[PDB]
Amino acid sequence: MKITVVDLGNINVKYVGENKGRFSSKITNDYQSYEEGFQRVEYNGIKTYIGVGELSREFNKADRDYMAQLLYSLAKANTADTKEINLTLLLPIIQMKNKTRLIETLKGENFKFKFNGIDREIKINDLMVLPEGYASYYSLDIENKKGDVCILDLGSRTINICVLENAKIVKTNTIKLGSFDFYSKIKSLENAKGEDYIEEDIQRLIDNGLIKVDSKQYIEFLSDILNAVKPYVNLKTYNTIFTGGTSLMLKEYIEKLPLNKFKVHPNALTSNVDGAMEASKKVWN
Amino acid sequence: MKITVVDLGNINVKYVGENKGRFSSKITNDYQSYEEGFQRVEYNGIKTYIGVGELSREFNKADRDYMAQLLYSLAKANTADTKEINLTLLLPIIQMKNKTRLIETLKGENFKFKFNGIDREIKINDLMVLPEGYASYYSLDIENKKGDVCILDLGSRTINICVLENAKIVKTNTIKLGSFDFYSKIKSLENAKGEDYIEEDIQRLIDNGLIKVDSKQYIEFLSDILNAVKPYVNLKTYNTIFTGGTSLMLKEYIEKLPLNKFKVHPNALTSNVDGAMEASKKVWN
Amino acid sequence: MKITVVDLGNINVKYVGENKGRFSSKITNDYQSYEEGFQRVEYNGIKTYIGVGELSREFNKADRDYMAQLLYSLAKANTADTKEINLTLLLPIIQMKNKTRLIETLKGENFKFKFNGIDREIKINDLMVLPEGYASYYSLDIENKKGDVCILDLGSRTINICVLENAKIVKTNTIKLGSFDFYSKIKSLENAKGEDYIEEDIQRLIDNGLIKVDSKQYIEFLSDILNAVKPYVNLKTYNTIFTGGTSLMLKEYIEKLPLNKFKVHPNALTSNVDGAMEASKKVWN
Amino acid sequence: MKITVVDLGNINVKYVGENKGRFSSKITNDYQSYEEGFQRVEYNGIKTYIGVGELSREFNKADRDYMAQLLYSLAKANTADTKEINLTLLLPIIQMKNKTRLIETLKGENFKFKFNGIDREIKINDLMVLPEGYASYYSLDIENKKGDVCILDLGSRTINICVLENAKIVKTNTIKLGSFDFYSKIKSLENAKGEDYIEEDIQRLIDNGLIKVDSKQYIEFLSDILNAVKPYVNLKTYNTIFTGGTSLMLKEYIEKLPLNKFKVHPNALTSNVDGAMEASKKVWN
Amino acid sequence: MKITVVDLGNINVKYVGENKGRFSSKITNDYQSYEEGFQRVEYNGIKTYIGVGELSREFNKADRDYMAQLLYSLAKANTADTKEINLTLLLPIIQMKNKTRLIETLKGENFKFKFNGIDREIKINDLMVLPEGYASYYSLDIENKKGDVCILDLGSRTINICVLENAKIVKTNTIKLGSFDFYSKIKSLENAKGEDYIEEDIQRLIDNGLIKVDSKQYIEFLSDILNAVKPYVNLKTYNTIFTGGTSLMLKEYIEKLPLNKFKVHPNALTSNVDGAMEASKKVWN
Numbered sequence A, B, C, D, E: 001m002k003i004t005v006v007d008l009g010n011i012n013v014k015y016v017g018e019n020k021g022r023f024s025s026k027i028t029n030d031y032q033s034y035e036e037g038f039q040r041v042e043y044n045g046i047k048t049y050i051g052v053g054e055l056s057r058e059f060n061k062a063d064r065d066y067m068a069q070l071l072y073s074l075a076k077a078n079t080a081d082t083k084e085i086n087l088t089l090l091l092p093i094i095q096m097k098n099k100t101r102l103i104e105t106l107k108g109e110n111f112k113f114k115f116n117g118i119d120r121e122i123k124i125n126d127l128m129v130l131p132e133g134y135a136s137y138y139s140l141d142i143e144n145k146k147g148d149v150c151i152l153d154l155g156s157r158t159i160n161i162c163v164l165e166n167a168k169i170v171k172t173n174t175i176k177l178g179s180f181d182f183y184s185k186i187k188s189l190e191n192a193k194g195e196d197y198i199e200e201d202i203q204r205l206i207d208n209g210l211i212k213v214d215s216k217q218y219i220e221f222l223s224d225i226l227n228a229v230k231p232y233v234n235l236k237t238y239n240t241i242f243t244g245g246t247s248l249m250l251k252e253y254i255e256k257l258p259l260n261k262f263k264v265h266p267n268a269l270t271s272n273v274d275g276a277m278e279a280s281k282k283v284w285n
């Protein structure tokens, strides 16, 4: 009946159902004393405190314990009364076969969990999966659908390329690259001097003004994500729709490019989710 | 019972049966993840995603894996219920003997294939073959049949000449030339500067306004396709019927010629198919 | 006085001067702590660690920062005492005009650089440029020069065709294709399952026995590089000289072809360099 | 002052001045990257690379862009110092009136051109024109001049007949036929099987041993060029002087004919040029 | 003359010279009455009792009072007679520049100290520094040097990764993680109940059987140190050499991994020291 979309992501989880929103992908099974005060979920006796701790850098995200974050998002989006829903997950455009390993464990499965002590249960009627990037196309404006575009989802570790002709995909590819490698690069020189920073506590430092990131350190990352797309796409052609949070981290610089036709998608952070929302409406409704 | 006509072509496939239409000749056996979203066919365990990828530039088109495109066209034209049909293929006017190598593999053969996952089967009662150009004559209007005409099919790589006297052919020839060489010429100067274009993604660029093709670049191609026909035909004589997609690419210029009597065939893209359709009606029906 | 030849290439750099040799085209500007242990060069304050990192997939290789690799090759080939030399670079056969943008920045220019901390300087008397493929002809044996041959340089991303009549070139063309697309194809299915491989760390895997490349995966690449040469050359004619590293990657299979006269050039990896070496001798000496 | 003779021909250009010689009639305006390496001429901003490309099959050779080949021959025959010369062109024996359209554009005209980058200029004092065949008579030996002969110039597409009584012409005619039609005939069956040959790259194949031309395929061409001369000449009468390159292509067979008196002209390839050379000497000198 | 190697470490000091050995990194400046009975060193009037007390958790170990432990190790390794030696210290692979701040204070410096009341003096001819991990490669067996390996030094707080191709390093990185965080995790739940344990007195408890460490508490730490290496290395590739004491704390579990090729280095505790010993021999001797 109700429909929900969950982009697990590697550093941010983005859910949209009856109530939309997002949070961080950090998950930790470590023991914690002041449980009342964290965001936590206990599934079949194992507890996880979300929003803090490690990052689960594992690739191939159909097996990276996509477990407590999913239920937490389901609880946070819908309400306690809801029992049966329809899930529309978003896997990368190169790992779409892994849905076989994904449906077998979720479809027609009843999940009971605490969600901060207020225990509840939820079932899913049917599961659905879409590739990242492709979904963001549907959220796109009509003016861009007609032409030949190139959805370029710049994730945290995955760049997903989906070249769309007049309402038909042509090229579909994935590249291992994103903001995470940039964070590793920054820490490679920061931790070197005397410090102890890591990939998780390094974006907040830039936000709060401790890491003096030079203007050209972003230019290098731009030219590195564009020296990995030439074999598959010519950006001057194929009017582009930059999406993903990484785009907003470089929006002030992506607009100063020698590209003849392009744009940065509005609400890029939630585009891949909103488009999948439309698609789910089209299918079930 | 039912009749179908399939012009495989080198850059466009054109089929006409219960439901007419066309598509691109691009075929690729490359692995693709998001299979659901492409147009695909799996024959005896080998899969092909049609409409994207390579071009299969091989000449002598009786052996260029005329395999998945044919079945895809058969499925797209007729319906799932249909089992037995009559095929009327169109080989060039110089490769008509190769029908021997063509009939032996198709006549009385049952073909089973997926066609985007909805597996089906089809048999062909008898196979028939006609030369390109000659067939387009039958689709021609009556006013032109009476006179002495010269069907000039300007394909992508083959110019087929069929000189018809009063309902009887006289001269029959094939020339290696067409729009593909023009595309190669354009890329020879475009890719030279800094670019990476190829023969496949170069027509769309002209359509979408990135390649500033000069007016005389078409004039050169016209005079090059006419400096290859003088030995066999004098165009001023033999009222001509330009056909093939290449003609429409030059219709605005072919009409400004110093030729005493000529025309560009209407629906030239599908003339060679419609005429063969009439001929098949005449034979079986 | 001294003469040097440098084929920058896209995945391998090949230099021949007083001391010949080669290395990888990988270049990275990323900060590195243990500088002593890498191969590095600092030019006008920007440092580059060669042999590791990215690949610089940019086409039109007259602008792809052909900068630190060139000086590194110059230092590694000649000795510290040498000051003035003559450079004979090798551009592709379709980008030979870009020498205008190449000579203006190098001719009569003194370059000072570190080369692993032992700072030195070097000047070049005059610059010279030759097209890829054509140069490899001169390294060829006499038995093949007399006839009508077709130098077919199968690079990593560029196939360069130079058809030579009796000591005179006829056809000259470039095609965007090579081993890099094959690596992308392999990773398209390897990274799909659960892995994280990329075009750079994928050949070593084949060498060390982790990627079970099927025998027909090479056959597909052969027939794909031969379905891109028919319009320009008929391989049965024009006795062929396969060159480039890609040929050695397929030497065991290129010899089982239905071609009437052909061969795989010995030391194909360095043929395009040795031939240019002869030509430079002829010109200056 | 100096004198030059230029037989443009349809497949071979033959010039004789201070330095004699010949080359191929192939001309192409197509863009080419490695300009240094071809034989090229740029006239008033349009460039042509001679010796490669198309063939310019147009008849009535007073308008077939007789433009870059002429200047190239002039430059190659004479030297850079020469400024004013006397031209003696050779039109067919049926198109001798077209000299009106030829003199108006050349006489007293200064032509400036590059000739492979070494720009130069040249003027012509007066222009002269002679018919093909007739000129070859003057190069003939004295033993044949006295009698009643029949100059039979077997060109590539034109057979020129000039019947000479005792130093006076009687019959003068032209026939559309020659080696080009034979090449078209050969390709009509070669390209049919699977191949892609054309009239331009088909003689070299015979020379290099790929086309197994049967002995009687030449006999058919002989009897076809002799079934087109009976109405105008009886070959048994009128002791004949076969000239033109086509004769050398059939010299081994023309000598086995049932003709009472005949011969194949020595240096037939250059006879029509040498005779015109004598005539020019007679007129101006 | 004599050579010594000192790995200060964060929880263990490891020295190798004329006499090898190790001890604990605990250092305390606190006053102690029964001085005779402890291991102590007094430098320029400040005394330190080694092997007991605090731990000096400071990172960037080029400034963490690397002072009394160093001299104590020097005295314990060599003998009283020795005056001049050569030091080969081991900094992490990300803090190798700090050698600048290290050499300035030690090179050519005479140090006088008590060493349990028997005052003595020592000078160092020259100082040398190597990165952790890289040094352990030299102690490795020949069978592993030839291949492409990945030295993975699992320290107490630092994981040092050095990817070695055929005798050449490629990737060099440091990660803040190790056994110390595991000890903090254990105490987080032990001290919670009623206890007062700390990171220093918690390993001995496991050894002596008071802390019932579950088998999966080590598995969590394994998967946490492997969820921090995927971005930089794929462990299935790059045959690995686990080193550092942490490896021995998990040797019984590291061998049950789904890794295709790996091993735990013998004498892992002293590998990083022995390899540096070889390197020092190579350089000075």
Ligand SMILES: Nc1nc2c(ncn2[C@@H]2O[C@H](COP(=O)(O)OP(=O)(O)O)[C@@H](O)[C@H]2O)c(=O)[nH]1
Pocket (backbone or CB within 6 Å): A007, A008, A009, A010, A011, A012, A013, A154, A155, A156, A157, A158, A179, A203, A244, A245, A246, A247, A248, A249, A269
């Ligand atoms: N400057 C800026 N950056 C943002 C904002 N929101 C997200 N980002 C960046 O976008 C990245 C999130 O990547 P994400 O789209 O979640 O990757 P995914 O989880 O793999 O899909 C983070 O690294 C952020 O730095 C924002 O509001 N401002």
Ligand SMILES: Nc1nc2c(ncn2[C@@H]2O[C@H](COP(=O)(O)OP(=O)(O)O)[C@@H](O)[C@H]2O)c(=O)[nH]1
Pocket (backbone or CB within 6 Å): B007, B008, B009, B010, B011, B012, B013, B154, B155, B156, B157, B158, B179, B203, B244, B245, B246, B247, B248, B249, B269
């Ligand atoms: N301008 C224009 N060109 C067209 C159109 N349809 C087809 N063409 C051109 O016609 C060519 C197709 O050639 P085709 O007839 O399929 O060759 P064949 O496959 O060998 O028979 C393409 O290169 C197109 O550029 C059209 O609607 N407009």
Ligand SMILES: Nc1nc2c(ncn2[C@@H]2O[C@H](COP(=O)(O)OP(=O)(O)O)[C@@H](O)[C@H]2O)c(=O)[nH]1
Pocket (backbone or CB within 6 Å): C007, C008, C009, C010, C011, C012, C013, C154, C155, C156, C157, C158, C179, C203, C244, C245, C246, C247, C248, C249, C269
């Ligand atoms: N099997 C094998 N392959 C090789 C060898 N050397 C080079 N190659 C292949 O040749 C390719 C190098 O292409 P290259 O000639 O450098 O392209 P270019 O840089 O554009 O000129 C690589 O992808 C290698 O896989 C060899 O010794 N054995």
Ligand SMILES: Nc1nc2c(ncn2[C@@H]2O[C@H](COP(=O)(O)OP(=O)(O)O)[C@@H](O)[C@H]2O)c(=O)[nH]1
Pocket (backbone or CB within 6 Å): D007, D008, D009, D010, D011, D012, D013, D154, D155, D156, D157, D158, D179, D203, D244, D245, D246, D247, D248, D249, D269
């Ligand atoms: N066997 C042979 N044939 C030749 C030779 N030279 C020229 N030919 C033939 O002669 C023809 C040239 O015809 P040509 O006299 O130039 O015709 P034109 O240009 O119209 O005057 C070519 O088709 C060649 O096959 C030769 O040395 N040997």
Ligand SMILES: Nc1nc2c(ncn2[C@@H]2O[C@H](COP(=O)(O)OP(=O)(O)O)[C@@H](O)[C@H]2O)c(=O)[nH]1
Pocket (backbone or CB within 6 Å): E007, E008, E009, E010, E011, E012, E013, E154, E155, E156, E157, E158, E179, E203, E244, E245, E246, E247, E248, E249, E269
């Ligand atoms: N089980 C076991 N563990 C050991 C042994 N020796 C050392 N360890 C562990 O290894 C760790 C020492 O780490 P270390 O290599 O000194 O880190 P570093 O000082 O930063 O280089 C300690 O936490 C010990 O628990 C041993 O013999 N047995």
Ligand SMILES: [Mg+2]
Pocket (backbone or CB within 6 Å): A007, A009, A132, A153, A155, A156, A244, A272
């Ligand atoms: Mg994403």
Ligand SMILES: [Mg+2]
Pocket (backbone or CB within 6 Å): B007, B009, B132, B153, B155, B156, B244, B272
């Ligand atoms: Mg056609």
Ligand SMILES: [Mg+2]
Pocket (backbone or CB within 6 Å): C007, C009, C132, C153, C155, C156, C244, C272
């Ligand atoms: Mg190359």
Ligand SMILES: [Mg+2]
Pocket (backbone or CB within 6 Å): D007, D009, D132, D153, D155, D156, D244, D272
């Ligand atoms: Mg002639």
Ligand SMILES: [Mg+2]
Pocket (backbone or CB within 6 Å): E007, E009, E132, E153, E155, E156, E244, E272
């Ligand atoms: Mg250590």
